[PDB]
Design a protein around this ligand. Structure first.
Ligand SMILES: Nc1ncnc2c1ncn2[C@@H]1O[C@H](COP(=O)(O)OP(=O)(O)OC[C@H]2O[C@H](O)[C@H](O)[C@@H]2O)[C@@H](O)[C@H]1O
Length: 165
């Protein structure tokens, strides 16, 4: 039931939309969160997803960390999607603004290949400081399963869809 997406490649689609609103409407099997290793969902995609779950995502995440410890940069875990999706795949892109290696963005996107269909954001392209077009290119060149990208920012979307991949 994904609607209004622009096709980028065989398997990658993109839309200027809030991932929270897409998730609410579509109720996908998997929504991806752009997480940090502590699953502290403060802002951006994570903060918005968590707010939409009325903090249930954070409560669940705190138990996950208490049991298992921090994720790896480039790593992931599958948790509930609460009222938004069946599952949330929390994926940690590199925090390039804090010196983490941009190469780990490829490792981060590889987690998507474990799921047939995902609704996802551009990892690392916000507060983590990776160039957004680079994140999109890594996504296209790494993910082989079917990924529906929700780009909140209109100006960014318009630039991305007019750029070579
Ligand atoms: N509601 C939204 N829907 C779709 N895209 C969004 C939304 N909000 C932001 N974006 C875009 O989504 C992209 C990613 O922006 P970011 O969410 O910062 O993720 P990161 O991987 O760079 O930083 C991770 C940290 O962000 C959190 O604080 C976490 O808790 C982590 O600490 C950008 O292009 C945004 O414009």
């Amino acid at each position: 039931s994904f609607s209004g997406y622009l096709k980028l490649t065989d398997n990658v689609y993109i839309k200027n939309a809030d991932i929270v609103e897409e998730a609410k409407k579509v109720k996908p099997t998997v929504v991806v969160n752009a997480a940090n290793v502590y699953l502290k969902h403060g802002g951006g995609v994570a903060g918005a997803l968590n707010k939409a779950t009325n903090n249930a995502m954070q409560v669940e995440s705190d138990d996950y960390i208490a049991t298992n410890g921090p994720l790896k940069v480039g790593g992931s875990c599958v948790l509930s999607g609460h009222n938004l999706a069946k599952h949330c795949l929390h994926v940690v892109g590199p925090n390039v603004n804090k010196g983490e290696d941009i190469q780990l963005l490829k490792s981060a996107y590889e987690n998507f290949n474990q799921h047939e269909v995902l609704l996802a954001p551009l990892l690392s392209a916000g507060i983590f400081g990776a160039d957004p077009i680079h994140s999109l290119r890594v996504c296209v060149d790494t993910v082989r399963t079917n990924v529906y990208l929700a780009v909140f920012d209109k100006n960014l979307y318009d630039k991305l869809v007019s750029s070579f991949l």
